[PDB]
Amino acid sequence: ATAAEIAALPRQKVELVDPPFVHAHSQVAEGGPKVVEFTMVIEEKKIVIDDAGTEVHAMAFNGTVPGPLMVVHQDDYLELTLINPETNTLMHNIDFHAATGALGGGGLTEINPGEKTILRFKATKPGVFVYHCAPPGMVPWHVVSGMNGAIMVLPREGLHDGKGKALTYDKIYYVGEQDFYVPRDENGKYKKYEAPGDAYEDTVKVMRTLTPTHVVFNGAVGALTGDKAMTAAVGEKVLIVHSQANRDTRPHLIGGHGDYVWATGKFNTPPDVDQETWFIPGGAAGAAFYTFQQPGIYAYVNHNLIEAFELGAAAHFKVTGEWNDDLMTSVLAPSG
Amino acid sequence: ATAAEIAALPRQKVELVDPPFVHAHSQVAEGGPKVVEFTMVIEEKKIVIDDAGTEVHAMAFNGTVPGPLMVVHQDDYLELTLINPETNTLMHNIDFHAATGALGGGGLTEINPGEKTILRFKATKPGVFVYHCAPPGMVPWHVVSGMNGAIMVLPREGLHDGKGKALTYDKIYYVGEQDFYVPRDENGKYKKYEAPGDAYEDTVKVMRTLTPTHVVFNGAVGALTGDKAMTAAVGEKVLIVHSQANRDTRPHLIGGHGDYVWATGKFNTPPDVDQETWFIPGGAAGAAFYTFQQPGIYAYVNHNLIEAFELGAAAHFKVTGEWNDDLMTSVLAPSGT
Amino acid sequence: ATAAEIAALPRQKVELVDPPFVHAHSQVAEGGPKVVEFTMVIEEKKIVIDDAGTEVHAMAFNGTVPGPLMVVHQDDYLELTLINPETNTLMHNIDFHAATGALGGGGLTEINPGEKTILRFKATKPGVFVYHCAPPGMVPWHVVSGMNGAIMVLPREGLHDGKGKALTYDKIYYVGEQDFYVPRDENGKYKKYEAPGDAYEDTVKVMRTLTPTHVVFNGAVGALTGDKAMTAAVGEKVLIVHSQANRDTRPHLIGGHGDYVWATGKFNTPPDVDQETWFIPGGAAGAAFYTFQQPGIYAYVNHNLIEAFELGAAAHFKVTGEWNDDLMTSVLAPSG
Ligand SMILES: [Cu+2]
Ligand SMILES: [Cu+2]
Ligand SMILES: [Cu+2]
Ligand SMILES: [Cu+2]
Ligand SMILES: [Cu+2]
Ligand SMILES: [Cu+2]
CATH class of the missing domain: 2.60.40.420 (Cupredoxins -  blue copper proteins)
Known part of the structure; x- marks a missing residue:
């Protein structure tokens, strides 16, 4: 598709819900390809993870560990608005394992606190796929502080x-x-x-x-x-x-x-x-x-x-x- | 499917053999679904695991680690008599990964020392599958003390x-x-x-x-x-x-x-x-x-x-x-060179 | 094949190249089965493995970790000349996971420093396969010192x-x-x-x-x-x-x-x-x-x-x- 072809596709705004539930969706695609729009806010927050009061500094997509499940169909476009509010302290980004190019989107989404970005990619392969933060030099620390989730690309x-x-x-x-x-x-x-x-x-x-x-x-x-x-x-x-x-x-x-x-x-x-x-x-x-x-x-x-x-x-x-x-x-x- | 029809089925009692050998069985099932009966007694016993004399308190189905392999065919019923002798000290049970419901059998087979139980399940899925003890609150400790084995459900x-x-x-x-x-x-x-x-x-x-x-x-x-x-x-x-x-x-x-x-x-x-x-x-x-x-x-x-x-x-x-x-x-x- | 048939097959000598590169080969085989000849010398040498100057005494087929990739086709014979120079200190051998018998060849290739051996095996199954050293009583120590590689047997x-x-x-x-x-x-x-x-x-x-x-x-x-x-x-x-x-x-x-x-x-x-x-x-x-x-x-x-x-x-x-x-x-x- 050309940029004009994409601009003519229908847009659908999705409201995310917290795991383990999944936002509403249809199994068989209702119609042809869409641009499916999501928004996530990053929150850095302390979480308590066991009954002894043990704390982790979580870095959470949408405030949950894991981040929420996003659902699209093959050959839709997923468009994500990602916001790093000024209340946070670290830079963050996102790598979608479902996406092709730029380190899964990580190289196009690096946002400091007070910034936002919008990334779009074509979901060309059907399956469930991990997404996670991956800031250069600090990749595994963001991921094992909870900054990861998954998307499902249905046929x-x-x-x-x-x-x-x-x-x-x-x-x-x-x-x-x-x-x-x-x-x-x-x-x-x-x-x-x-x-x-x-x-x-x-x-x-x-x-x-x-x-x-x-x-x-x-x-x-x-x-x-x-x-x-x-x-x-x-x-x-x-x-x-x-x-x-x-x-x-x-x-x-x-x-x-x-x-x-x-x-x-x-x-x-x-x-x-x-x-x-x-x-x-x-x-x-x-x-x-x-x-x-x-x-x-x-x-x-x-x-x-x-x-x-x-x-x-x-x-x-x-x-x-x-x-x-x-x-x-x-x-x-x-x-x- | 009915309680009646199940009591009508032929019964075959198998004597288990110690791994790595396997009791006699046929690969192709002779005739229709059967109720295949097994008996295991649980033993808690000290075993030596190396030439240095290292000891472990093992918890062993039928006295061996692993427990013996049971063989049935798809849609047979497996009926296990499981015995926990009063010389043992702990409660035990069994979870068959081949079985459907009640935590693989484990919620129906909790036996204290001096107790026995009989469980029957339909082997609906062909494959090899693990079984193991899984008592509430002490699950990994009984598994890593040797309390596990496998079954084979042949097509x-x-x-x-x-x-x-x-x-x-x-x-x-x-x-x-x-x-x-x-x-x-x-x-x-x-x-x-x-x-x-x-x-x-x-x-x-x-x-x-x-x-x-x-x-x-x-x-x-x-x-x-x-x-x-x-x-x-x-x-x-x-x-x-x-x-x-x-x-x-x-x-x-x-x-x-x-x-x-x-x-x-x-x-x-x-x-x-x-x-x-x-x-x-x-x-x-x-x-x-x-x-x-x-x-x-x-x-x-x-x-x-x-x-x-x-x-x-x-x-x-x-x-x-x-x-x-x-x-x-x-x-x-x-x-x- | 008859004994005379096997003895009559063409021979091809291949010069190895260091990883990550691979020696020249054809994907589709050109002609009938051959005896593909390779020579590797074993080197025990100190290598530096990180930025802090950390050393290991590597045990290296052909001088590299990993050893080089050898490529043959299904039903070719691979004939390896393996040399252990007098300047090394340890006995070595080779097990090809691609081969059938004698512990992958390990039983037939134990060479002390100053010795060579030539092993031939038929590559009956297509795939990529590990090869590694495996001297009795010291197998993991040679493997985790770098003495391993892979071969590819193409259809x-x-x-x-x-x-x-x-x-x-x-x-x-x-x-x-x-x-x-x-x-x-x-x-x-x-x-x-x-x-x-x-x-x-x-x-x-x-x-x-x-x-x-x-x-x-x-x-x-x-x-x-x-x-x-x-x-x-x-x-x-x-x-x-x-x-x-x-x-x-x-x-x-x-x-x-x-x-x-x-x-x-x-x-x-x-x-x-x-x-x-x-x-x-x-x-x-x-x-x-x-x-x-x-x-x-x-x-x-x-x-x-x-x-x-x-x-x-x-x-x-x-x-x-x-x-x-x-x-x-x-x-x-x-x-x-
Ligand atoms: Cu992050
Ligand atoms: Cu990743
Ligand atoms: Cu037990
Ligand atoms: Cu289990
Ligand atoms: Cu070696
Ligand atoms: Cu091996």
């Missing part, structure tokens, strides 16, 4: 299985997994600081050990459990988008499966089926589709079970419906 | 390649890989404890470093080497099932390949072919098929070669038969 | 996609990634040693932490950046071969994609498509094919970004050509 015709059959989800949830590296003093207590830049040197020391102190979903231990559990019902088709911008993960739904999994995240590669545990490399997003067949509590975990149960990488689904005894039954309940 | 028509050609193995071995986290004293010497409970706090400290002290096949360093090496012959088709319930691994057969590898472990996903090194993420099982074409010793390793040769994750195959010089030959043996 | 009809369409590259580069484990003294300074054997105990202690001190491409921090960036032009098709003999990696082209990725490295397994980040397990090689669409500087990284930008695993591509504003454009440049 215009919606999702399909390997053999061209349509896959239509009832519910979608976005789980962003974050490794954090919090410094400790000589008594093994986590340190606190009064500004992000003050934590920089101590944090780099921990990062170089390659071992996170916490690995969490949606920005904190227990964020998606108990009463902030994701919900579904028996018979509902659910798409679970999962991203990790820095470190590998191996998601598993305890009690379920991934019926179709795009473990690479890319919808032109056919999905793996019937998976117990799938693998998403650091720097990628993946998606799993599952139809719930049994009610009750499911845990959704990174299946390095130390990372899930000791370091924080565990969420719940609460699923309503009737029990199927053909699939599973207690023949003799625990007894003497 | 009823047996295995096939990506394009419908039948693949029939002559023999099957199950390699369970285990990461252990053994606490050290001030001299760097491994510690010993009286009961499993006593080791808990020090072991969680090592677990949180995410760095195992030992990574082993079949429960110990060198367990599947020497007189305990797996065996085959030139021309023999072997299926190697490998599981890791907690940590990634990257198996490789030194001197061979994986001719067809279901690296995800699931037989409706077509296999990768001609693999050098394949990758099984923590919490999964995979399977590789190979036809041996050369005699001699092979080593089967996790190809982080520090984990293989320093931490324990190496086994041997001894293969009989004739050498093929077309595939490889020494044109000039090591000689002076 | 006789050249590369194709999943749907049997030909893929022809214009340029090929080989990126070998190396994890090093360099000991430190109690002051945190890296140690130096007179002879390789003097470093053995201290190095195995670091190896057993599973945490590298440096993760590099082509043997050193920054080896493929600046004036040594890899080059291409918009519209050129590049094949990037990447190996890691001991530890996993997750390559990503910042600003691009892998249009076709043989992540397993084996050309009978259909490629994944449209990849953002792909995953190569330790002990394997992989290959990614990309057509460049935008000019500029791209970084090619291991996307554990701590490993890329703190520990050394980052390279650059410099790509010439005209900017395409359809794919990406700055609608509003950073402004107050």
Whole structure:
């Protein structure tokens, strides 16, 4: 397309919503290509990530860790307004792994506090893709301070299985997994600081050990459990988008499966089926589709079970419906 | 589907065998869906994992680490009697990744010492799958103390390649890989404890470093080497099932390949072919098929070669038969310049 | 083939070139199977691997880390002459993951200083494959001292996609990634040693932490950046071969994609498509094919970004050509 051709396309303004929910969208594209417009404000803020009151200086797209999920269709244009308010202290930018050129947009979006920028790119490849900050010289520090999220580029015709059959989800949830590296003093207590830049040197020391102190979903231990559990019902088709911008993960739904999994995240590669545990490399997003067949509590975990149960990488689904005894039954309940 | 129709099905009681061997089974299912019955008793026991005498309090399904492989076919019912003897000290349960609902069985099978339970589930999805203990609040500690194994759900028509050609193995071995986290004293010497409970706090400290002290096949360093090496012959088709319930691994057969590898472990996903090194993420099982074409010793390793040769994750195959010089030959043996 | 047939095949002697470049070869084979002859000399030498003057005693096929890429076609025979000069101190050998039997050749090629050997094997399976040294009882120590490389066995009809369409590259580069484990003294300074054997105990202690001190491409921090960036032009098709003999990696082209990725490295397994980040397990090689669409500087990284930008695993591509504003454009440049 020429610049004139693009200027004649319809514009659509999208309101973002906080993870794990996803803004409203249509699976099959309603019409031809659009310029889809989003706006995000960056907030630097302290977050508390566990029940011991441990703090991280988060650098958050839209004020959440992860940043929100943006949804477009193949061959739409994504137009982002990115704002770094004067209340912040650091320069920031954005690299979309879905985009082609200029370091995924990082080289065109460097904004100091009090600045804004607008970037547009054509979403030429369908799939789920990571986005993250990447300021020169400080790339990994922004990413492991929570400045990352994902976008989904749906095929215009919606999702399909390997053999061209349509896959239509009832519910979608976005789980962003974050490794954090919090410094400790000589008594093994986590340190606190009064500004992000003050934590920089101590944090780099921990990062170089390659071992996170916490690995969490949606920005904190227990964020998606108990009463902030994701919900579904028996018979509902659910798409679970999962991203990790820095470190590998191996998601598993305890009690379920991934019926179709795009473990690479890319919808032109056919999905793996019937998976117990799938693998998403650091720097990628993946998606799993599952139809719930049994009610009750499911845990959704990174299946390095130390990372899930000791370091924080565990969420719940609460699923309503009737029990199927053909699939599973207690023949003799625990007894003497 | 009905309670009635299920009690009408034939029952077959299987006697389990210790890894790396697998109980007798047929690849192609003979006749219709069955209720296949297994019994395992849980043992808490001290095991020695290296030649230095390092001890771990293991928590072992059927007394072995890994637990034994169970084989059924798709749409069979697996019925497990699980027994926690009153000589044990902890509650245990089982989560089958092959099963659907109730945390894979784990929410229905919590048994204290002196208790037993019977669980039945329909094996709806073909593949190899991990099982493991998962008691609320102590999940990784029972897994990394050895409490895990695998099952294989064969398609009823047996295995096939990506394009419908039948693949029939002559023999099957199950390699369970285990990461252990053994606490050290001030001299760097491994510690010993009286009961499993006593080791808990020090072991969680090592677990949180995410760095195992030992990574082993079949429960110990060198367990599947020497007189305990797996065996085959030139021309023999072997299926190697490998599981890791907690940590990634990257198996490789030194001197061979994986001719067809279901690296995800699931037989409706077509296999990768001609693999050098394949990758099984923590919490999964995979399977590789190979036809041996050369005699001699092979080593089967996790190809982080520090984990293989320093931490324990190496086994041997001894293969009989004739050498093929077309595939490889020494044109000039090591000689002076 | 008969014995006389094998004995009658044409021989071709190939001069190797240092990575990241590759010796001249044809994609589509020209004529029937051949015996392709290569000679490599092993060098044990001290190399400097970062900007701080940190030394390692490298053990280097042909004098380089990684060793060079050898290219043959399926069902050719590769015949290697391997020489261990009298000035080295250790026995060495070679295991080709491409070969069948005798531990990949390792059992037949153990040469002490002052010895040579000639090994021939038939390249029966197409793909990229790791090769590395593996002397009994000292395998990891030779591998993590740099003694590894890769070979490519191309299909006789050249590369194709999943749907049997030909893929022809214009340029090929080989990126070998190396994890090093360099000991430190109690002051945190890296140690130096007179002879390789003097470093053995201290190095195995670091190896057993599973945490590298440096993760590099082509043997050193920054080896493929600046004036040594890899080059291409918009519209050129590049094949990037990447190996890691001991530890996993997750390559990503910042600003691009892998249009076709043989992540397993084996050309009978259909490629994944449209990849953002792909995953190569330790002990394997992989290959990614990309057509460049935008000019500029791209970084090619291991996307554990701590490993890329703190520990050394980052390279650059410099790509010439005209900017395409359809794919990406700055609608509003950073402004107050
Ligand atoms: Cu930032
Ligand atoms: Cu990135
Ligand atoms: Cu248990
Ligand atoms: Cu599990
Ligand atoms: Cu060597
Ligand atoms: Cu190897």
